[PDB]
Design a protein around this motif. Sequence first.
Motif, mmCIF file in Angstrom:
data_model
loop_
_atom_site.group_PDB
_atom_site.id
_atom_site.type_symbol
_atom_site.label_atom_id
_atom_site.label_comp_id
_atom_site.label_asym_id
_atom_site.label_seq_id
_atom_site.Cartn_x
_atom_site.Cartn_y
_atom_site.Cartn_z
ATOM 1 N N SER A 5 0.805 -1.236 0.000
ATOM 2 C CA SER A 5 0.000 0.000 0.000
ATOM 3 C C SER A 5 0.843 1.293 0.000
ATOM 4 O O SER A 5 0.331 2.369 -0.316
ATOM 5 C CB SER A 5 -0.940 -0.017 1.216
ATOM 6 O OG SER A 5 -0.213 -0.191 2.430
ATOM 7 N N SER A 6 2.138 1.199 0.320
ATOM 8 C CA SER A 6 3.066 2.339 0.473
ATOM 9 C C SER A 6 4.408 2.139 -0.269
ATOM 10 O O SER A 6 5.353 2.911 -0.075
ATOM 11 C CB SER A 6 3.318 2.605 1.971
ATOM 12 O OG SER A 6 2.116 2.856 2.693
ATOM 13 N N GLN A 62 -2.563 9.856 -5.691
ATOM 14 C CA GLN A 62 -3.705 10.299 -4.879
ATOM 15 C C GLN A 62 -4.803 9.225 -4.751
ATOM 16 O O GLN A 62 -5.633 9.326 -3.843
ATOM 17 C CB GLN A 62 -4.299 11.600 -5.460
ATOM 18 C CG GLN A 62 -3.286 12.738 -5.695
ATOM 19 C CD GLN A 62 -2.529 13.141 -4.427
ATOM 20 O OE1 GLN A 62 -1.398 12.734 -4.189
ATOM 21 N NE2 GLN A 62 -3.115 13.943 -3.560
ATOM 22 N N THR A 63 -4.806 8.198 -5.619
ATOM 23 C CA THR A 63 -5.834 7.136 -5.665
ATOM 24 C C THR A 63 -5.267 5.717 -5.670
ATOM 25 O O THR A 63 -6.013 4.774 -5.411
ATOM 26 C CB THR A 63 -6.737 7.311 -6.893
ATOM 27 O OG1 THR A 63 -5.947 7.176 -8.055
ATOM 28 C CG2 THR A 63 -7.444 8.668 -6.929
ATOM 29 N N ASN A 64 -3.975 5.552 -5.977
ATOM 30 C CA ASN A 64 -3.276 4.273 -6.174
ATOM 31 C C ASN A 64 -3.800 3.467 -7.390
ATOM 32 O O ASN A 64 -3.495 2.278 -7.530
ATOM 33 C CB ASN A 64 -3.230 3.446 -4.872
ATOM 34 C CG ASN A 64 -2.616 4.221 -3.709
ATOM 35 O OD1 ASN A 64 -3.309 4.770 -2.859
ATOM 36 N ND2 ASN A 64 -1.296 4.286 -3.632
ATOM 37 N N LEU A 65 -4.576 4.102 -8.279
ATOM 38 C CA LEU A 65 -5.092 3.522 -9.525
ATOM 39 C C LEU A 65 -4.104 3.744 -10.679
ATOM 40 O O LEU A 65 -3.295 4.674 -10.656
ATOM 41 C CB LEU A 65 -6.463 4.149 -9.849
ATOM 42 C CG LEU A 65 -7.553 3.931 -8.776
ATOM 43 C CD1 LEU A 65 -8.797 4.758 -9.123
ATOM 44 C CD2 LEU A 65 -7.936 2.449 -8.639
ATOM 45 N N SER A 66 -4.166 2.907 -11.711
ATOM 46 C CA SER A 66 -3.369 3.105 -12.927
ATOM 47 C C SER A 66 -3.844 4.322 -13.740
ATOM 48 O O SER A 66 -5.038 4.623 -13.833
ATOM 49 C CB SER A 66 -3.355 1.832 -13.785
ATOM 50 O OG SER A 66 -4.658 1.402 -14.144
ATOM 51 N N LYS A 67 -2.900 5.032 -14.368
ATOM 52 C CA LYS A 67 -3.168 6.243 -15.159
ATOM 53 C C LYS A 67 -3.775 5.964 -16.557
ATOM 54 O O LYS A 67 -3.908 6.882 -17.368
ATOM 55 C CB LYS A 67 -1.876 7.076 -15.256
ATOM 56 C CG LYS A 67 -1.382 7.605 -13.900
ATOM 57 C CD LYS A 67 -0.179 8.537 -14.099
ATOM 58 C CE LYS A 67 0.309 9.076 -12.750
ATOM 59 N NZ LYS A 67 1.441 10.026 -12.908
#
Length: 115
Positions: A5-6, A62-67
Amino acid sequence: GSSGSSGLTQQSIGAAGSQKEGPEGANLFIYHLPQEFGDQDLLQMFMPFGNVVSAKVFIDKQTNLSKCFGFVSYDNPVSAQAAIQSMNGFQIGMKRLKVQLKRSKNDSKSGPSSG
């Protein structure tokens, strides 16, 4: 396991998660990817066209989602050009992928000469 997560492990010395590259012209940027695709999904998608040296999906902090975009590079430019010619325009759900060569500075030529 298998994710953090980090942060992440030093396993990015392989292909998936890696930021190395092959010879000039063997270097690709990929766009319009699914929000569920990671570095290994992009690797498995690009393995069919030859020896992949690196594969990567960029992540929003800011979301940990793929761009919805990534990078891939091969041991040869011909394996890379075979991936552009197979995956540029590829439909995946309700939209189509785009694939292009690495953009950079030039001096022996004034531009790409086509578009």
